[PDB]
Design an enzyme around this catalytic site. Structure first.
Site, short mmCIF file in Angstrom:
data_model
loop_
_atom_site.label_atom_id
_atom_site.label_comp_id
_atom_site.label_asym_id
_atom_site.label_seq_id
_atom_site.Cartn_x
_atom_site.Cartn_y
_atom_site.Cartn_z
N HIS B 21 25.88 37.35 38.63
CA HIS B 21 27.14 38.05 38.54
C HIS B 21 27.06 39.29 39.44
CE1 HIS B 21 30.98 39.32 36.70
NE2 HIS B 21 30.45 40.53 36.76
N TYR B 65 30.54 40.30 45.46
CA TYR B 65 31.50 40.81 44.48
C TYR B 65 31.06 42.21 44.02
CZ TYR B 65 33.35 36.09 43.64
OH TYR B 65 34.01 34.85 43.83
N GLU B 148 30.56 27.87 41.36
CA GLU B 148 31.13 28.93 40.58
C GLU B 148 31.08 28.43 39.13
OE1 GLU B 148 35.56 29.01 40.46
OE2 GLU B 148 35.15 31.13 40.80
N1 LIG Z 1 29.79 44.36 30.37
C1 LIG Z 1 30.55 43.51 31.04
N2 LIG Z 1 30.83 42.24 30.65
C2 LIG Z 1 31.68 41.54 31.43
N3 LIG Z 1 32.34 41.92 32.53
C3 LIG Z 1 31.96 43.17 32.91
C4 LIG Z 1 31.09 43.96 32.23
N4 LIG Z 1 30.81 45.13 32.90
C5 LIG Z 1 31.54 45.04 33.97
N5 LIG Z 1 32.24 43.88 34.10
C6 LIG Z 1 33.24 43.59 35.14
O1 LIG Z 1 34.44 43.15 34.49
C7 LIG Z 1 35.10 42.15 35.29
C8 LIG Z 1 35.25 40.75 34.64
O2 LIG Z 1 33.98 40.35 34.13
C9 LIG Z 1 34.20 41.96 36.53
O3 LIG Z 1 34.51 42.82 37.61
P1 LIG Z 1 35.82 42.87 38.55
O4 LIG Z 1 35.61 44.08 39.35
O5 LIG Z 1 37.03 42.86 37.64
O6 LIG Z 1 35.82 41.58 39.53
C10 LIG Z 1 36.71 41.14 40.55
C11 LIG Z 1 36.81 39.62 40.36
O7 LIG Z 1 35.57 39.04 40.71
C12 LIG Z 1 35.28 37.98 39.80
N6 LIG Z 1 33.81 37.79 39.78
C13 LIG Z 1 32.99 38.86 39.77
C14 LIG Z 1 31.68 38.70 39.96
C15 LIG Z 1 31.07 37.40 40.13
O8 LIG Z 1 29.88 37.25 40.33
N7 LIG Z 1 31.97 36.34 40.09
C16 LIG Z 1 33.33 36.54 40.03
O9 LIG Z 1 34.13 35.61 40.22
C17 LIG Z 1 35.76 38.49 38.49
O10 LIG Z 1 36.07 37.46 37.48
C18 LIG Z 1 36.99 39.33 38.85
O11 LIG Z 1 38.18 38.58 38.73
P2 LIG Z 1 39.68 39.01 38.47
O12 LIG Z 1 39.87 40.33 39.26
O13 LIG Z 1 40.56 38.03 39.14
O14 LIG Z 1 39.86 39.28 37.00
C19 LIG Z 1 32.84 42.48 36.07
O15 LIG Z 1 31.89 42.83 37.16
#
Ligand SMILES: Nc1ncnc2c1ncn2[C@@H]1O[C@H](CO)[C@@H](OP(=O)(O)OC[C@H]2O[C@@H](n3ccc(=O)[nH]c3=O)[C@H](O)[C@@H]2OP(=O)(O)O)[C@H]1O
Ligand SMILES: Nc1ncnc2c1ncn2[C@@H]1O[C@H](CO)[C@@H](OP(=O)(O)OC[C@H]2O[C@@H](n3ccc(=O)[nH]c3=O)[C@H](O)[C@@H]2OP(=O)(O)O)[C@H]1O
Lengths: 523, 523
Positions: B21, B65, B148
């Protein structure tokens, strides 16, 4: 099994099933005596499984098989005949053209040539649906909506044959009768009278020769070998003077703005001709046509640029050909080898009339413009296309999602993609900004989109996107529908997705390179 | 039904299933406390059906990301964490990413967000195969071999989280730590020490400034607004003098032959920069990077041309960046607006180091070269490509036939296709000359092929072929095998089909425009 090779929804039984066969000079009459497997030749195919008599549902397509095989580029075309099967015939449409697959799937003998087995009782029993015989149907070609019919040699003996057209009976020069017949396909549509173009061109070439300032411009001519650089120079001046002739006036007007039509391009063209024509070539139309056909730049003399045929009146095409003729005559002495005088006025003209006809025929045929279906849009160094035909369709009338892929790359050094312009209609066509992205060599980059007016959102890559030799991108657009109501034409302002390339302060007004992918709304 | 949306051959149950992640600056530590659906944001997706926690099997992909969302172009990258599910987890690979299709086919409720239903007992009962939970797997992106993972928010609470990398802990300038980590993916491979490049560049910019003939060349400078035409002129001379500096020597050698690397292109580049940078932009890295990223010509300073990254030593990249910096400083006064002095040495450098890293990363990633798989070969105005990936494969080891389609068109005026060069191996790979043809806007044209050496046959269109804006062709090659024996590498001399474009007496040796489509032999 059988529904893996036969497409039963498009197979039917017909009474008095008819089709066309293009026939060579020498056989228009005799083939009317009846269809029979010839004693000489491949008998329909190099491959045994595919030997049989060939016809097509399109008489204009049949016409493309009518040219003397010994001079296929410039020989006489013979004609078209219509062949008809009495009674009932089963047209069996195939999903595949692979004979081993069809013999397997259709569970036939793997040994016997498929086309021999189609003419058997047993085969006709099983697939004829009560017809007296089976004919196989395949798509004629990519980009065509015709079909090709493959007839068993023996079953073909039942065909009745009648004359559609004997082009030689037409009494025209070159392949004029064949091309006028094919132009009928479109009634838009280049339907030129080549007899007239042929006649005006001669009159014009003659008149220009007599013209004093021309006869003079010629007097300035080195009249012996000079580098194309100075031959180009003499030629542009010569062009510049001949085009002032009152008989090439309209031509003077129509070639004034477009750069492709410039005097430099007529000189670049004439130099290219004089340099590929030797005496033996000059003496044979076929070989003259074979050499002229591989040179670049013919669009300058044709008035063809940007998807359009600009020289489309007998008068203007005759001026352009007459001007081209005179300039090859001038180019020959400076950059070539032969009897300049001769070729230019004769086989050069006969041959270029033929290449005009070849190219007008293509523009008369249905085709996809750049950025439509899977045709690429080529601009500023970039090449972009919808990955598949379905990607280019935005379906409507349902709640849910769709995904659409656009290929993007550039020819050499790394060119940026600034973003993209997408149509939006709230509820009926929203952009899902999570699922939409651009993948560069597998690196997935999300976008940030912003509203615009015209129901257009502008999306930019979160990180920098560059494409080029070795670096390619996939732009994946994910659309979301919260309404099941169909998109109406009123609601949509654009018919294309706009990829934006690099920025130029072209006009001292910052402008982006624009690449368009045209879509269609359906369902 | 279910086998229309789930691909069971690539679905498996795993114990201690792990993934990555990408995490933003601010969350590398706290996310280690556990995975939880956030209170702010789209929670994984704009679309309800797709809301959930996202991971990928590739840590370098996860790393993309991790950039501060407020300055995605130039901000800090946070890190990567690995999340693991204790026990057994079912990874269910989907054939489709359309949530309405999956809910229908999988016969689930059409109402509830699919990702909520994946975390239900019933759903886990039915598809978990005895695993404690189900995670959905989809291809990460086109051109990528990653996957993914879409995790149900509630089931994700069971994940254990550990630090892979915290890039900020690395203490590097810009996004140096993120890009060095991603370069690990390839060990060929651009693995530059940017600290060194950053340091040598500064030293060089400083030294060039002190250089007397440079300090002088500058004295010739109009030092006020002049048209880019004269600004281009001052700049090429300035470049011509700075490149004589002993510290830009190697650079002097490596940019001497290639035209992309010429002094004119460094001046064209510097002029483009000075003209898009104003004081506010000059003051913000993000906006500086946003503007620099949409300009053409960066390949000149990068040493990137023809599919290759030529400037690939810290020393030469530092020389090229230092030379570019100095020249923007000169260009600013002549064609721009701001504090030339400042920008050029600072945010211009910081920003261009970042675009180098963006472009090196793409070249470090697996990609298809022109004319491979469906990537087009772009040359002399033509665009050609294998219509589909299977077309590019010549299968072997069987008696029978194959067909292979190549798309052909050209950007504007009508360009000819002289013929094509095809590999032949008697028995194992013959050309069926009846079935092989070229279709121009649906017009089917047969070919005449002739032997050559290298087991290559040269086929020419029976009639003239021209392509261009509005005129496209499909070259359909039909191969026939009379032997069931496999083609051996020894037997094949070429790895591409050669389409021949127009002829040029380039070198005063007639040469045809060459377009290549690379194939692969399989089975
Ligand atoms: N404690 C936590 N538990 C869960 N989430 C947390 C936590 N702390 C931080 N987060 C953040 O919360 C969001 C959803 O999990 C993610 O970031 P984003 O900046 O919104 O991330 C931007 C987008 O990148 C996507 N994405 C991110 C990283 C990756 O490896 N793959 C991917 O597809 C996310 O789903 C997100 O989608 P959406 O914006 O379309 O919702 C994540 O990094
Ligand atoms: N009395 C006759 N009965 C039957 N054939 C006769 C007769 N008289 C003349 N022919 C000629 O004999 C050949 C096979 O029928 C055809 O010409 P081709 O010049 O070999 O024709 C050239 C190729 O064009 C194909 N083709 C021709 C026209 C058409 O409309 N569709 C098509 O696909 C042919 O099958 C042929 O294939 P193969 O060369 O691969 O065998 C045909 O015109």
């Amino acid at each position: 099994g059988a529904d893996d090779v036969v497409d039963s929804s498009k197979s039917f039984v017909m009474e008095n099933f008819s089709s066309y066969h293009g026939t060579k000079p020498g056989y228009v009459d005799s083939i009317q005596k009846g269809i029979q497997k010839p004693k000489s030749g491949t008998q329909g195919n190099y491959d045994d499984d595919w030997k049989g008599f060939y016809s097509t549902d399109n008489k204009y397509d049949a016409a493309g098989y009518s040219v003397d095989n010994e001079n296929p580029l410039s020989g006489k075309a013979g004609g078209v005949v219509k062949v008809t099967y009495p009674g009932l015939t089963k047209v069996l449409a195939l999903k595949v053209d692979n004979a081993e697959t069809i013999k397997k799937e259709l569970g036939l003998s793997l040994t016997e040539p498929l086309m021999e087995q189609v003419g058997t009782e047993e085969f006709i029993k099983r697939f004829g649906d009560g017809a007296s015989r089976v004919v196989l149907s395949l798509p004629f070609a990519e980009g065509s909506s015709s079909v090709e019919y493959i007839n068993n040699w023996e079953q073909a003996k039942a065909l009745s044959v009648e004359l559609e057209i004997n082009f030689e009976t037409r009494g025209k020069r070159g392949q004029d009768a064949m091309y006028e017949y094919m132009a009928q396909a479109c009634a838009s549509c280049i339907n030129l009278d080549w007899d007239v173009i042929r006649d005006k061109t001669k009159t014009k070439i003659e008149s220009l020769k007599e013209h004093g300032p021309i006869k003079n411009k010629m007097s300035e001519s080195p009249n012996k070998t000079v580098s194309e650089e100075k031959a180009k120079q003499y030629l542009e001046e010569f062009h510049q003077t001949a085009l002032e002739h009152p008989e090439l006036s309209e031509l003077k007007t129509v070639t004034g703005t477009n750069p492709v039509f410039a005097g430099a391009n007529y000189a670049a063209w004439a130099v290219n001709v004089a340099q590929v024509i030797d005496s033996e070539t000059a003496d044979n139309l076929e070989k003259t046509t074979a050499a002229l056909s591989i040179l670049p730049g013919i669009g300058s003399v044709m008035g063809i640029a940007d998807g359009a045929v600009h020289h489309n009146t007998e008068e203007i095409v005759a001026q352009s050909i007459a001007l081209s003729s005179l300039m090859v005559a001038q180019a020959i002495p400076l950059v070539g080898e032969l009897v300049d005088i001769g070729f230019a006025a004769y086989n050069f003209v006969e041959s270029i009339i033929n290449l005009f006809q070849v190219v007008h025929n293509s523009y008369n045929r249905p085709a996809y413009s750049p950025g439509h279906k899977t045709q690429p849009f080529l601009h500023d160094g970039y090449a972009v296309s919808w990955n598949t035909v379905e990607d280019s369709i935005i379906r409507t009338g349902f709640q849910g999602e769709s995904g659409h892929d656009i290929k993007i790359t550039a020819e050499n050094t790394p060119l940026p993609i600034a973003g993209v312009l997408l149509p939006t209609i709230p509820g009926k066509l929203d952009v899902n900004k999570s699922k939409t992205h651009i993948s560069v060599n597998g690196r997935k980059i999300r976008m940030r989109c912003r509203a615009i007016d015209g129901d257009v959102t502008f999306c930019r890559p979160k990180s920098p996107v560059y494409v080029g030799n070795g670096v390619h991108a996939n732009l994946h657009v994910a659309f979301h529908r919260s309404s099941s109501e169909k998109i109406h034409s009123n609601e949509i302002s654009s018919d294309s997705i706009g990829v934006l390339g690099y920025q130029k302060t072209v006009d001292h007004t910052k402008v982006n390179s624009k690449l368009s992918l045209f879509f269609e709304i359906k369902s």
